[PDB]
Design an enzyme around this catalytic site. Structure first.
Site, mmCIF file in Angstrom:
data_model
loop_
_atom_site.group_PDB
_atom_site.id
_atom_site.type_symbol
_atom_site.label_atom_id
_atom_site.label_comp_id
_atom_site.label_asym_id
_atom_site.label_seq_id
_atom_site.Cartn_x
_atom_site.Cartn_y
_atom_site.Cartn_z
ATOM 1 N N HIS A 60 0.844 -1.204 0.000
ATOM 2 C CA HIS A 60 0.000 0.000 0.000
ATOM 3 C C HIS A 60 0.889 1.267 0.000
ATOM 4 O O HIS A 60 1.581 1.553 0.975
ATOM 5 C CB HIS A 60 -0.934 -0.032 1.218
ATOM 6 C CG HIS A 60 -1.896 1.117 1.252
ATOM 7 N ND1 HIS A 60 -2.800 1.335 0.248
ATOM 8 C CD2 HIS A 60 -2.054 2.131 2.134
ATOM 9 C CE1 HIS A 60 -3.484 2.436 0.502
ATOM 10 N NE2 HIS A 60 -3.046 2.940 1.641
ATOM 11 N N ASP A 62 0.924 5.292 -0.278
ATOM 12 C CA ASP A 62 0.137 6.522 -0.222
ATOM 13 C C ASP A 62 0.836 7.613 -1.016
ATOM 14 O O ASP A 62 1.988 7.919 -0.715
ATOM 15 C CB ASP A 62 0.057 7.021 1.220
ATOM 16 C CG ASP A 62 -0.700 6.076 2.094
ATOM 17 O OD1 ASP A 62 -1.788 5.774 1.662
ATOM 18 O OD2 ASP A 62 -0.210 5.652 3.175
ATOM 19 N N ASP A 174 -8.067 1.144 1.508
ATOM 20 C CA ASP A 174 -7.886 2.168 2.521
ATOM 21 C C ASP A 174 -8.872 3.366 2.619
ATOM 22 O O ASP A 174 -8.869 4.030 3.634
ATOM 23 C CB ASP A 174 -6.435 2.688 2.470
ATOM 24 C CG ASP A 174 -5.917 3.145 3.882
ATOM 25 O OD1 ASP A 174 -5.018 3.991 3.950
ATOM 26 O OD2 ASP A 174 -6.400 2.643 4.928
ATOM 27 N N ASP A 311 1.608 -1.286 4.443
ATOM 28 C CA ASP A 311 2.107 -0.003 3.930
ATOM 29 C C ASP A 311 3.535 -0.080 3.453
ATOM 30 O O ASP A 311 4.445 -0.542 4.196
ATOM 31 C CB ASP A 311 2.055 1.079 5.019
ATOM 32 C CG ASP A 311 0.634 1.478 5.420
ATOM 33 O OD1 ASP A 311 -0.347 0.834 4.987
ATOM 34 O OD2 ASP A 311 0.517 2.473 6.194
ATOM 35 N N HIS A 441 -6.722 9.365 -0.826
ATOM 36 C CA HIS A 441 -7.416 9.290 0.463
ATOM 37 C C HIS A 441 -6.687 9.959 1.675
ATOM 38 O O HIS A 441 -7.143 9.801 2.834
ATOM 39 C CB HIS A 441 -7.828 7.809 0.771
ATOM 40 C CG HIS A 441 -6.666 6.858 0.795
ATOM 41 N ND1 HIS A 441 -6.215 6.191 -0.333
ATOM 42 C CD2 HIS A 441 -5.837 6.495 1.804
ATOM 43 C CE1 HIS A 441 -5.153 5.465 -0.019
ATOM 44 N NE2 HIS A 441 -4.903 5.638 1.268
#
Ligand SMILES: *[C@H]1O[C@H](CO)[C@@H](O)[C@H](O)[C@H]1NC(C)=O
Ligand SMILES: OC[C@H]1CN[C@@H](O)[C@@H](O)[C@@H]1O
Ligand SMILES: [Zn+2]
Length: 1014
Positions: A60, A62, A174, A311, A441
Site C-alpha cells: 500500500h 500513499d 484504505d 504499507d 485518500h
C-alpha cells in the site's frame, strides 16, 4: 429508460434498511474481537472439492501522507518498484499487484529501455498486475465523481499507452468508508469486479454471518440491476497481514515474515513469526490452514483471497526473499498433504475473481444483491471517521475550484487543434495530474501532515495557473478574427477574475480594471459558460471608478449596479470585527448572458458622472457606536443605525428577514405566502477531556454543540436593484447572505484562529417535520436517504456533504447546496447543520502523528433553497434515494460551475468578436457535458474528441419546462467521420453510432462518446 423514482428496487441487502434493524453492539468476539469464534466442518473440503487459496502480495503506497509524494517515491516506492521488477523477473511464480499509477508512471519514466522491456514482460505474463489503475486510490467521501473519473482516466490512459493493459478489477483497501459512486463509474469503465475494506465493524459482522461479504452492488435507484458490479468486502479490521489470513491476528501475525527483528518490526500479540523449516512446517501449516478454513466459512465459494501486504511493503530484496521463501515452503507442504484438501499459491486479484466466477458459473454459489453505501465508517468502538469530512476545509474548497478550472480549460481548448509550441497538452496534463493526485485518500480528506498538505496546495496552485494559461489563450483564439489572430503562446492576453477563490478576505488577488479619461476609457471582458445551455448569471468586476457603464458587443446598454468593496477586519484596537470600504476601487455588477459551452464579450466604459444604466447600492451599517465610512468617489453616503431586524427582497424573489444579529430568521416565497421560520445559527463542538480525542480522522464531540456567543456584532446591509446582502462579523466567521432575485447565496469567511479543540458548525433551524430523515449526496452524483439513529452516537450520524443536503416534510423542503465538501447532519427534526472548520490539538491514533493546527481563512459558499414540494412526484417512503428540484440543481451548478470571467490585459483588443457558440444546442436542464476533451495531438490525421455526458434526475413538480434542442455531441465539431460510444475513460469503443449521432442518455445515466474528424 428506467424510472428512477417510482419503482423501489428489490435487493437482498439494502443498507438503510439493514441499519434500521442492526443493533451495533460492540461485544468482545474473542480473538476475532469484532466477530465470533468461527467454526467449520473439516469434512467440507475433500479430494473432489478442495479449497483453492490465492495469496496476493501487495504494497500500500500513499501518494503523500506522512511524507510528500516525492519524498515517499525517493525513500521508499522507487525501491519497492525496482526490487519488484528484479524479484518477479527472477522468480517466475511470484506475483504482485499494484494500484497507484501516479507512482508507477513516476518510476517508469526514470527506467532505461532494457528495464522498461523487462517490466512490460512481467506485466504481459501476468506476474505484476495492476488493480483499478487509477492515478491514486481515491477518497470516496469528499471526492466529486467527476474527479474520481478524471483520476481513473489519467491512470488507465497511461496504462493503456505504456503497458497495453486496462484493469477490470478494482482494489480499494484504505478509503475511510465506501461509496456506490465507485461501482457506478467502474461498471461504466469496463470493470467486472471490485474489492473494498473499510466498512463499519458491525456491518462486517452482520454480512459475514449471512455470507453476504460478496455481493452484486447496484445503485439505489436501479430496479433492473444493469449497474451491478460484483464486490468483495474483506471481513476483518485491517488490510495488514495480521488481519488478512484469518480471524486471529495473533496467529496471522506469525505469517508476516518481515516481523522477526532485523526489519525493526514485531507482533504486538507477542508471538513472533518463525522461519519455516522441515521440522516446523507441519505445525505452522496446521495453524495457517485452520485460519484459512475459518476465513473461508465467511464466503460462498471454494476460492479464497488472502492479501499479503501492508504499507510500503516489499521494499528490501531481503523482505521479498523472506516472504517468498517462507510461503513457498508452506505451499509445498500444504499442497502435498492430502488431508488439508487445499491447493495454495501466489496469485493476482484478477486470478481470484476469475476463479470465483468459474465456481459461480458451475452452479456452486449464487450471490446476494445489495444497494446503499458504507458511511459513516467506525474501525472500533465509537471511533467514527466523520472528522475527515471537514478537515483542512481550505483545500477541500480548492478541490472544487480546480475541478471546474480543469473542466473549463479542457473544454475551451478542445475546440481547436493546437501547435505543440502552444504547450496546451503539457499544461492540461499537469493540471489533470495535480488534481488527480489530490483525490488521494490522504489528500482531499485533510489527513496528511502539515508539510504534505502544503505540497498538495502548491501543486494545485500550479495546476490553477496552467488552467488559466490555457483558458486565456483559448478565449483569445475563439474571439479574434482569424486573419488577425496573432498569438504569442507565452503572452497573457486575458487575466481570469474569480470572485470566490481564494475569496475576499482570504487573498487580495483580483485585479482592478483601471479606467480613466487620461489613461484608458474602456475595457473588454469576456464570460465563458461551460454548461450546455444558455445561461444568465450576475458577474462582478473591480473597477477604479464608480462611474462605469456596461454594453454588449452590439453596443446595447446592459443594466448594471455598483457597490462598494467592503473588507472585514478584526480590529485589535477596538476589539470589534467591522467593515472598511475601499476609497480606490468599486464593484460593478451586471447580468451576463452566455451561449451553451460558449463565450460572450462585454465592454465597461468610464464616464464623468452617473451613467444612465448604472445604479448604486445604498449601504447601512448597524452597530452601536458607529464611526463614518468614507467611500472615495462612491455617490451614496453610508447610513448608520442601532442593530435591528430587517427584511429585504430583490426582484420578484423571496423576502428574507434577519435578526438584529444579521442572521436569517425567515423566508417568504411570494408577497402573499407565510414567513417560513428558517434560522441560521453558529455553534461549537469541543473535544473530550477523558478518553479518545478527535483528530484529523475522528469526530469525538464532548456532547451537543453550544451556541457561539455573539455579543452585539456589526451588521452591514447593502441594498441594490440587482444584488443586496446582509453581512455580519461573528467570532471566527464573517457570515453573508446575498440576494440576486432567487434562492440566496451564503458565504462564510471562516477563520478559526487559535481556538484550539473547537469545531465550528453552521446550523439551520426550521419547523419542517422531517423527523429522523434527511438526504445527503454521494460524490455530487446522487442523493441518498439518511435516517438519524439515536442508537448511534452523534458522530455516527454525521455524513459527507460533498455538494448538498436537504430535509423535507409533506409540503416543504429546505436544500443547502455547497461549493465544497464538508461534514454534516440533521440531529433533530427540522434541522440541517454542516461543519465549517475544526482545529484539534491532539493526534487521534491513526498514524498521522499530529492534530490539526494549520487552519487558514477559507471562504465557504452555499445556496439555500426553500421550496414547496407537495406537488412534486417523489419516490415512495421505502425508496432509498432522493432527487433535487430544478431550482436546487441549478443552484448547485451556480456554485460548482459558475461562468468564468476574463479581463483583456492590454489596452486594445484588435479583431475582438462578440460571441462564440451562439449556434451550440441548448440542452435540457438535467443534461450536462461533464467533460469535453480533445484526445489527439495536432499531428494526428484523424482528430478525436471525447465527451462525457451525464443526465441527473430532477423532480416533476408541475412546471411545464419545455422547448430545448437535442444535444448531439458528435456534431459539435465539423467534418465528423465517425461517432462511437465508449467506456467513460474513452479507452474502449463499445458502439459504432448510426449517422454519427450521439444519442442523449437516460436520467441518472452517464455515457462517453468520441467523435473522429478528418
Ligand atoms: C497488447 O494488447 C493486445 C494483447 O492482448 C494486442 O492488441 C497486442 O498484442 C498488444 N498491443 C499493442 C502493443 O499494440
Ligand atoms: O489510519 C489511517 C491511515 C492508514 N493507512 C495509510 O496508508 C493512510 O493513508 C491512512 O490515512
Ligand atoms: Zn493509505
Amino acid at each position: 429508460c428506467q424510472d428512477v423514482v417510482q419503482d423501489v428496487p428489490n435487493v437482498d441487502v439494502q443498507m438503510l434498511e439493514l441499519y434500521d434493524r442492526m443493533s451495533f453492539k460492540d461485544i468482545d468476539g474473542g480473538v476475532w474481537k469484532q466477530g465470533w469464534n468461527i467454526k467449520y466442518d473439516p469434512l467440507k473440503y475433500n479430494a473432489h472439492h478442495k479449497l483453492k487459496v490465492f495469496v496476493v502480495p501487495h504494497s500500500h503506497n500513499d501518494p503523500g501522507w506522512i511524507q510528500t509524494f516525492e519524498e515517499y517515491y525517493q525513500h521508499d516506492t522507487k525501491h519497492i518498484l525496482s526490487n519488484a521488477l528484479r524479484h518477479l523477473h527472477d522468480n517466475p511464480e511470484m506475483k504482485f499487484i499494484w494500484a497507484e499509477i501516479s507512482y508507477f508512471a513516476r518510476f517508469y519514466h526514470d527506467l532505461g529501455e532494457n528495464k522498461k522491456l523487462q517490466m512490460k514482460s512481467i506485466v504481459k505474463n501476468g506476474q505484476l498486475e495492476f488493480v483499478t489503475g487509477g492515478w491514486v486510490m481515491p477518497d470516496e467521501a469528499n471526492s466529486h465523481w467527476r474527479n474520481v473519473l478524471l483520476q481513473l482516466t489519467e491512470g488507465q490512459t497511461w496504462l493503456k499507452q505504456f503497458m497495453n493493459v486496462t484493469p477490470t478489477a478494482s482494489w480499494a483497501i484504505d478509503p475511510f468508508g465506501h461509496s456506490p459512486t465507485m461501482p457506478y463509474i467502474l461498471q461504466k469503465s469496463g470493470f467486472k469486479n471490485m474489492l473494498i475494506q473499510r466498512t463499519h465493524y458491525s456491518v462486517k459482522k452482520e454480512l459475514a454471518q449471512q455470507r453476504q461479504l460478496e455481493f452484486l452492488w447496484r445503485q439505489i435507484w436501479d430496479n433492473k440491476g444493469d449497474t451491478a458490479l460484483f464486490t468483495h468486502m474483506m471481513p476483518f479490521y485491517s488490510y495488514d497481514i495480521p488481519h488478512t489470513c484469518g480471524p486471529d491476528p495473533k496467529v496471522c501475525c506469525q505469517f508476516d515474515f518481515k516481523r522477526m527483528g532485523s526489519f525493526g518490526l514485531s507482533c504486538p500479540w507477542k508471538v513472533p513469526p518463525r522461519t519455516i523449516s522441515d521440522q516446523n512446517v507441519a505445525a505452522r501449516s496446521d495453524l495457517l490452514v485452520d485460519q484459512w478454513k475459518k476465513k473461508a466459512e465467511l464466503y460462498r465459494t471454494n476460492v479464497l483471497l488472502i492479501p499479503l501486504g501492508d504499507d510500503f511493503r516489499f521494499k528490501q530484496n531481503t523482505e521479498w526473499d523472506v516472504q517468498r521463501v517462507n510461503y513457498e515452503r508452506l505451499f509445498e507442504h500444504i499442497n502435498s498433504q492430502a488431508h488439508f484438501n487445499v491447493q495454495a499459491q501466489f496469485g493476482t486479484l484478477q486470478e481470484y475473481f476469475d476463479a470465483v466466477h468459474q465456481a459461480e458459473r458451475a452452479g456452486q454459489a449464487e450471490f446476494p444483491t445489495l444497494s446503499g453505501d458504507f458511511f459513516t465508517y467506525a474501525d472500533r468502538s465509537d471511533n467514527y471517521w466523520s472528522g475527515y469530512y471537514t478537515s483542512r476545509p481550505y483545500h477541500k474548497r480548492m478541490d472544487r475550484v480546480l475541478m471546474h478550472y480543469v473542466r473549463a480549460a479542457e473544454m475551451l481548448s478542445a475546440w481547436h487543434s493546437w501547435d505543440g509550441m502552444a504547450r496546451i497538452e503539457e499544461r492540461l496534463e499537469q493540471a489533470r495530474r495535480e488534481l488527480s493526485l489530490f483525490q488521494h485518500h490522504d489528500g482531499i480528506t485533510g489527513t496528511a501532515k502539515t508539510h504534505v498538505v502544503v505540497d498538495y496546495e502548491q501543486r494545485m496552485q500550479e495546476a490553477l495557473k496552467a488552467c488559466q494559461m490555457v483558458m486565456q489563450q483559448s478565449v483569445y483564439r475563439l474571439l479574434t478574427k482569424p486573419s488577425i489572430y496573432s498569438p504569442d503562446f507565452s503572452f497573457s492576453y486575458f487575466t481570469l477574475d474569480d470572485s470566490r477563490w481564494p475569496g475576499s478576505g482570504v487573498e487580495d488577488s483580483r485585479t482592478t480594471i483601471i479606467l480613466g479619461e487620461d489613461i484608458l476609457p474602456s475595457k473588454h471582458v469576456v464570460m465563458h459558460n461551460t454548461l450546455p445551455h444558455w445561461r444568465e448569471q450576475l458577474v462582478d468586476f473591480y473597477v477604479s471608478s464608480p462611474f462605469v457603464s456596461v454594453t454588449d458587443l452590439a453596443n446595447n446598454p446592459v443594466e448594471a449596479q455598483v457597490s462598494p468593496v467592503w473588507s472585514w477586519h478584526h480590529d485589535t484596537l477596538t476589539k470589534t470585527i467591522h467593515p472598511q470600504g475601499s476609497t480606490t476601487k468599486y464593484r460593478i455588477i451586471f447580468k451576463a448572458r452566455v451561449p451553451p459551452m460558449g463565450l460572450a464579450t462585454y465592454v465597461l466604459t468610464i464616464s464623468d458622472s452617473k451613467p444612465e444604466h448604472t445604479s448604486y447600492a445604498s449601504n447601512l451599517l448597524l452597530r452601536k457606536n458607529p464611526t463614518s465610512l468614507p467611500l472615495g468617489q462612491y455617490p451614496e453616503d453610508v447610513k448608520f443605525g442601532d442593530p435591528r431586524e430587517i427584511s429585504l427582497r430583490v426582484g420578484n424573489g423571496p423576502t428574507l428577514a434577519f435578526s438584529e444579529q444579521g442572521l436569517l430568521k425567515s423566508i417568504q416565497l411570494t408577497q402573499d405566502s407565510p414567513h417560513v421560520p428558517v434560522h441560521f445559527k453558529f455553534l461549537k463542538y469541543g473535544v473530550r477531556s477523558h478518553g479518545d480525542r478527535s483528530g484529523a480522522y475522528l469526530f469525538l464531540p464532548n456532547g451537543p454543540a453550544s451556541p457561539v456567543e455573539l455579543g452585539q456584532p456589526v451588521v452591514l446591509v447593502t441594498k441594490g436593484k440587482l444584488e443586496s446582502s446582509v453581512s455580519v462579523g461573528l467570532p471566527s466567521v464573517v457570515h453573508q447572505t446575498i440576494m440576486r432575485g432567487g434562492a440566496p447565496e451564503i458565504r462564510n469567511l471562516v477563520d478559526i484562529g487559535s481556538l484550539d479543540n473547537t469545531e465550528i458548525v453552521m446550523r439551520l433551524e426550521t419547523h419542517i417535520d422531517s423527523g429522523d430523515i434527511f438526504y445527503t449526496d454521494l460524490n455530487g452524483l446522487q442523493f441518498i436517504k439518511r435516517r438519524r439513529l439515536d442508537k448511534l452516537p452523534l458522530q455516527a450520524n454525521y455524513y459527507p456533504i460533498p455538494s448538498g443536503m436537504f430535509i423535507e416534510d409533506a409540503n416543504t423542503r429546505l436544500t443547502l447546496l455547497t461549493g465544497q465538501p464538508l461534514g454534516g447532519s440533521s440531529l433533530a427534526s427540522g434541522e440541517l447543520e454542516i461543519m465549517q472548520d475544526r482545529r484539534l490539538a491532539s493526534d487521534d491514533e491513526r498514524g498521522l502523528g499530529q492534530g490539526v493546527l494549520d487552519n487558514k481563512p477559507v471562504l465557504h459558499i452555499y445556496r439555500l433553497v426553500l421550496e414547496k414540494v407537495n406537488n412534486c412526484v417523489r419516490p415512495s417512503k421505502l425508496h432509498p434515494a432522493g432527487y433535487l428540484t430544478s431550482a436546487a440543481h441549478k443552484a448547485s451548478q451556480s456554485l460548482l460551475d459558475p461562468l468564468d470571467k476574463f479581463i483583456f490585459a492590454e489596452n486594445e483588443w484588435i479583431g475582438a468578436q462578440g460571441q462564440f457558440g451562439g449556434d451550440h444546442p441548448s440542452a435540457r436542464e438535467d443534461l450536462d457535458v461533464s467533460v469535453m476533451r480533445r484526445l489527439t495531438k495536432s499531428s494526428a490525421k484523424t482528430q478525436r474528441v471525447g465527451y462525457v455526458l451525464h443526465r441527473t434526475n430532477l423532480m416533476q413538480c408541475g412546471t411545464p419546462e419545455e422547448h430545448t434542442q437535442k444535444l448531439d455531441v458528435c456534431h459539435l465539431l465539423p467534418n465528423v467521420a465517425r461517432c462511437e460510444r465508449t467506456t467513460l475513460t474513452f479507452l474502449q469503443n463499445l458502439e459504432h453510432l448510426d449517422g454519427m449521432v450521439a444519442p442523449e442518455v437516460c436520467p441518472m445515466e452517464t455515457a462517453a462518446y468520441v467523435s473522429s474528424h478528418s
